[PDB]
Amino acid sequence: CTSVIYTAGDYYFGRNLDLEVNLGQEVVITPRNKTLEFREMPNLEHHYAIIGMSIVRDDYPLYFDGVNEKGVGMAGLNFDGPAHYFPVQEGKDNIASFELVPYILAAASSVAEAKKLLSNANIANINFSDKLQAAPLHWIIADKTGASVTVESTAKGLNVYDNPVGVLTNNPEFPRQLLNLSNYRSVAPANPANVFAPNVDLPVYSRGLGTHFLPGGMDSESRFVKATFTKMHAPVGNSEVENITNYFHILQSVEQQKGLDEVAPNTFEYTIYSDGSNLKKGIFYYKTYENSQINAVDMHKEDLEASELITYPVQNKQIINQQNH
Amino acid sequence: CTSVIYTAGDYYFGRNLDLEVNLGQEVVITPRNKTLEFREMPNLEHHYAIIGMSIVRDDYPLYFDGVNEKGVGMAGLNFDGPAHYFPVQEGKDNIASFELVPYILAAASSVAEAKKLLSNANIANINFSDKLQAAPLHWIIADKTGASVTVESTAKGLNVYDNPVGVLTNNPEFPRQLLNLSNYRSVAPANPANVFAPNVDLPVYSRGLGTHFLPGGMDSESRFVKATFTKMHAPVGNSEVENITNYFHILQSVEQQKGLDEVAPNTFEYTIYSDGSNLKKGIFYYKTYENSQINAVDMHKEDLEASELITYPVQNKQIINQQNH
Amino acid sequence: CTSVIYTAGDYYFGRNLDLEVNLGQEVVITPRNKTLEFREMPNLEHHYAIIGMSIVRDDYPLYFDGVNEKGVGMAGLNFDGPAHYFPVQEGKDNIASFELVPYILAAASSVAEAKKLLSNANIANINFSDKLQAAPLHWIIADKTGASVTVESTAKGLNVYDNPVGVLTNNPEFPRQLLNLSNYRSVAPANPANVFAPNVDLPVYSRGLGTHFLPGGMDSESRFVKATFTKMHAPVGNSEVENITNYFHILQSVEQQKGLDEVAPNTFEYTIYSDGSNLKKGIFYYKTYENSQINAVDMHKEDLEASELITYPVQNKQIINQQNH
Amino acid sequence: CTSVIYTAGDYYFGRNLDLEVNLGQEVVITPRNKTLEFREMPNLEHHYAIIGMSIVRDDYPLYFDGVNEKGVGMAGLNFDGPAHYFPVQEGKDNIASFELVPYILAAASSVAEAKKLLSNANIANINFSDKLQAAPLHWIIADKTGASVTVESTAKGLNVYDNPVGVLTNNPEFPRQLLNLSNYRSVAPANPANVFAPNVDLPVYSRGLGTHFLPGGMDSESRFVKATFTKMHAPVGNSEVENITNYFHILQSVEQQKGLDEVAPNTFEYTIYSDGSNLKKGIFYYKTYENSQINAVDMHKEDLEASELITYPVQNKQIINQQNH
């Protein structure tokens, strides 16, 4: 998985979900008056409206990622190994891993408020059910000011790190992942000057040599570096349509194609979907691996004062424009 | 630019066109009875039908790439530096660089026949006009048997190389480009065994480490390696729609996003379009940078006995499916 | 800097010292009855004999690295950034950074005993003097059983990590440095099988392609990977002379040549000396950058019951064998 | 193998010889009046004096490399695959592969003269004997002006290329090897500015990050890049002793340690010797893998008017300075 905030125009947040099987994901709008229950905290009877990619069990929106009406975005990304959840702790705001995205998107109007909400929190080892055990995750939170943080619960406890690049992938822990970027300081979009052998003619035989050492692997560190470079050098678009076009090109740079990331015999981790939302306008856009046409769900076309989840199925059939006849 | 033959199903051939400006490209069908004039060879009054991406000047189809009705595909890719064209030579079949794609697609029913057509050929330094000077190019030819060759005219003369990987990008010359793949023999989709320090626990902290050293740069060598890996490990799809979906994912792996390959101030080489055709059925598919929906032009829905070029404009507006209302 | 334990024969421990200036280093033997004073712990009036590379101030052996008569080796390596020393703490064994190598080598007969000695320790922010301020360091301890640990005092406190590779360089912190080795699992001394494009002839045009992705940079991460590979694949020598020959070849693989690691204008970090000792026999061997002949100081040829430091100057003139006359 | 000219002081030329077995190499001086026989050219009864590393069969100096009294150096390096020798050709100066180094060093007073001597030459497929078949080689020639060329006989014929970097290793052919350096234009001794994410703090956590992408592998391309960087950034020494010290540090950067380059089970290509000569003074220096002390053979201490080969055995026992007693 790879999640980014693209800081152009209204600003755009979302993620690639990389996995070897589909999950039953659908587009879910949680309206302001849908009651959100929590295992160790008060229920939220009224809260911010949410739109995102989710599964639904027992009428609960188990979000993979989403954005709320106040311009806050959040995504949960696989974190298998470092992730550690703790027993319920007296005097701490105890949040199950499956509750964290619904809770923050319901309650926080900014990254700054999300930090306050997490300042006395504990990610508790609470399973949704016997069928759905807690999965190892970490999270990125971003908002329409451009701010973002990385939330990791590990053996050390709960850490909320400023995220200066607005990117997150999988392992390792965030300080290690961020430090690795320093190894790539010399990589650039423009052709490098010859500092290797300055008094020797070393012909520039190809365009693009500025990115000769840019990683293109399927692994988590490679994708973190390549996605950071791609988002940091993305254009400033003119329109909203240009900006969402540019956004998906960022995510596409670290898409995992089928066949390239083998996790078991005949089994490959690939980008099952890519989504991104306009943070100011609450428009959710997504593509699936099987359909290249972008789909848009505008949360404000719905009844955000409703009290039941509103859902749409992901359009996963390739829609080809038959241009001639 | 990157061109590939994807050897699944009916087999699929095409290219990314990477450039810093649009060219006026359109989809062009050359029917069997469109007369094709040649500067130093007999006119072809009747020939195979062609579909591809082209510009048109003086009613001549200046193809960037295309396929013909017999399942032969061909693409011209920038080759600035090594490319050399020669004066017209007595006793040689003299072909202008701008004529080579129209000529081979009109006259050859296989890569094998294309080899015979080139066995006494000379790529002549003939300009289309004073406005359109000859550009430095090399070419890949592929067919529905899976065969392919790389055609390069350099200071050494005209070389036609067997292409064992069915891929071509830009510089350097093909033997050098092919040899470079040997440096990547150890890169694989599956997780590598620990041969680095076999008696030490080196945890597999991420999926995808098989491709940790896979290049992700924008330059010609990086894209050649990454595209070869991606096509060599692409799935065998079930349907025609799955196969064209898989095909564009191959090309997408080496797409050049805006902002990453700077060629002059504020000027970036990016993938202006991607196309790919079913070699058996003569269906041409394409995307533009600005539109993620795939477009299809079926050559057999046209009058292939016509005598005038048939053209369609590239659909370059992002077509977003507005899912809710 | 790079420190290694070479697990062949009697076993051999030492380090490259990489710096941009000389330090006044000399070879120092601390005999059993040289009193070693400590700022916050009892003096050691009798202890194990030590030999190593050191400077001497106020008749105190400020060791960079050394080994003791019981087969324990220890080295202090620059750790600028992560290193943090704490105020003196009640109820903790408080050890100044400049005391740690003299103390462990004087008091510990094994890595296991060194772990016990550090189990309630605090690396205190105590300067040797106003002229010699505390420098940021971390340490490797190894012994003749092959065991080794990495000692780091950071903002987290004092950590003593099992060191499964018997190597240490500079930044970053040890868990991050060790995790990075997992990225190199596929690198090997033998030629790799073609898993990149298995059905394509990719000729093995050079020997040594197993190490094509082995780092050769001057930076701390590059040297950690290359030194680990080189020591892990070093031969098992026949004699003691062959083993010390093999040992220096390990250190030489990550030597920093003058001109390659620029730290300020005209200023280069280079390997000012390399040393290594037979852990069982207490023989200290060293080379300087300016002299390629190995020099040996056998600690047991000295009076190890003495009470004063015994010193030898480093032989830093190139001794060339004039073979003909 | 790796051969370099180090352009400091009097200038210094030589090579690492990398192989999996010893060859019986000795130091050989060919005096001016030693008759040199040639299979297809006139004998040289009088010629320039030569010193170098060689084997001797039938009183013929089969040089691996050497320098002559006029400041010309030459080395033969393995070139298995591209190397092609031709039948004896009428009207060409036909030179056996085993004769080329003795011939050029005997007859040429500069690289420019060596070019003239090769302008009508053919490297003929002539074996020294049935026991010593012709081995595949290419060659570097350098002189005390700093000039150098690369000599390759391949399927294309005989090519003599200007060598702008004064380095040669093994495969591939020289234009490909030289072009590969352009991929490393951004590698430098100084710390790189942050062009990757310019508005983000990417801490410089280690010195030496300028060379983070510098290759450290055992293969021919890796060693070519690393040796070129190391020689191009070597210091300008003060004395002759400093210069020969600096020279061996250049060769040491691409030494192949035992255990790292496996060519068959239990069989490793390693640097059996390293040599380098003062081009102006005709002093030959060498080390063996087993002996770190530099050895010097001054050709002018010999009778250069003699008519028989003068030989010295390589000092291959480690000479350790026993500093204490």
Residue numbers in the entry:
A (entry chain A), B (entry chain A), C (entry chain A), D (entry chain A): 2 to 326
From the reporting publication:
Bile salt hydrolases (BSHs) comprise a diverse family of microbial enzymes that catalyse critical BA transformation. Primary conjugated BAs synthesized in the liver, such as the tauro- and glycoconjugates of cholic acid (TCA, GCA), are deconjugated by BSHs to generate cholic acid (CA) (BA names and abbreviations are summarized in Supplementary Fig. 1). We found that Lactobacillaceae BSHs display a clear bias for either glycine or taurine-conjugated BAs. Notably, each monomer contains a loop that swaps into the active site of a neighbouring monomer within the tetramer and places amino acids proximal to the catalytic residues.
